Write a protein that binds this ligand. Structure first.
Ligand code: DHC
Ligand code: MG
Length: 329
């Protein structure tokens, strides 16, 4: 049957990106099939419908497009309750941390997310250090490195670690590294794959223990007005492909793509070196991490927010969904 509604989905990553290939294409396929063609989904990668990645959230909210995928922290100050998921050593896997992020959003961010229908509120998989030249074997090695992070709280951590943070969306990272504006970038390994950085940032540092260095909250966001405009028999077709299960799935795709990329480097199929900092060394980065946590909670409280409560709930949810994933397998 002919399209009753065409949904334009706009994002900042290339079509070859794992989340595009393994989530957005199947999402398109299921929405079009289950709607018997009454819903058409058009995917627009690489900012093909214009603007820059910080503009994405409002493109969906304001209805310039129907669906976006973005980083909430690309808009500094805008999603203060979401910032709890940027904190050091809070996250585990993409899969578990995403499910925690979706539940957290549903229970704490109803005001912050007013005007968008959340298909998935999720995080990326473990954030790691990627550099052009410097093998980071110790805290001292990051001193004075120009490092790109996605958000003011990850940049805050990078500065407390003794780096020089330069805030920008990861889409500027290729050119900035190319021209010597950056020494490197934090991102998960699947983002290395996506952005074609494997042959540029060839030094990679990961950590010891039951928590990743950091992550950041992302969103697959639908214009609430466009959802509200759908007939009562097409709204449930969206609902069937929206919520915490979708967030878990996005995190799982990234986790799997991380593993492929890390294996490819370790095997010598792709040039690079992976350096895992031992327990004692990691403990040094976690001790700085705690100072950022303590600071954020104090900042939050002075500003009215119950930061301590939001931090306790975010950490409880990560542990809950991590243990549930661990018990199953
Ligand atoms: O740090 C950033 O600015 C973006 C991070 C990001 C974006 C897309 C992904 O699929 C992913 O794993 C990480
Ligand atoms: Mg709207």
């Amino acid at each position: 049957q002919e399209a009753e509604y065409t949904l334009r989905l706009h994002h900042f990553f290339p079509a070859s990106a794992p989340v595009h290939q393994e989530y957005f294409l199947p999402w398109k396929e299921a929405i079009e099939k289950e709607s018997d063609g009454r819903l058409a989904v058009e995917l627009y990668p690489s900012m093909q419908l214009g603007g820059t990645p910080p503009s994405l959230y409002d493109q969906a909210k304001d209805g310039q497009v129907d669906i976006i995928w973005t980083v909430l922290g690309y808009n500094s100050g805008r999603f203060p309750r979401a910032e709890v998921f940027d904190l050091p050593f809070l996250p585990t896997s993409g899969a578990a941390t995403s499910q925690a992020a979706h539940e957290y959003a549903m229970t704490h961010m109803q005001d912050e997310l007013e005007g968008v229908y959340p298909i998935a509120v999720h995080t990326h998989s473990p954030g790691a250090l990627h550099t052009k030249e410097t093998r980071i074997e110790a805290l001292e090695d990051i001193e004075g490195l120009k490092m790109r992070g996605p958000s003011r709280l990850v940049n805050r951590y990078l500065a407390k670690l003794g780096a020089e943070p330069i805030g920008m969306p990861v889409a500027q990272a290729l050119e900035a590294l190319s021209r010597g504006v950056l020494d490197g970038t934090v991102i998960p390994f699947e983002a290395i794959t996506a952005m074609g950085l494997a042959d540029i940032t060839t030094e990679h540092t990961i950590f010891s223990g039951d928590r990743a260095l950091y992550t950041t909250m992302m969103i697959v966001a639908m214009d609430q007005d466009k959802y509200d405009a759908l007939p009562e028999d097409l709204q449930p077709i969206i609902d069937a492909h929206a919520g915490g299960r979708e967030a878990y799935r996005i995190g799982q795709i990234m986790d799997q793509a991380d593993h492929r990329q890390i294996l490819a480097i370790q095997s010598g199929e792709q040039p690079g070196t992976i350096t895992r900092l031992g327990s004692e060394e990691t403990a040094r980065w976690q001790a700085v991490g705690q100072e950022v946590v303590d600071e954020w909670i104090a900042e939050a409280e002075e500003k009215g927010l119950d930061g301590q409560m939001l931090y306790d709930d975010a950490t409880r949810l990560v542990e809950r969904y991590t243990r549930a994933a661990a018990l199953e397998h």
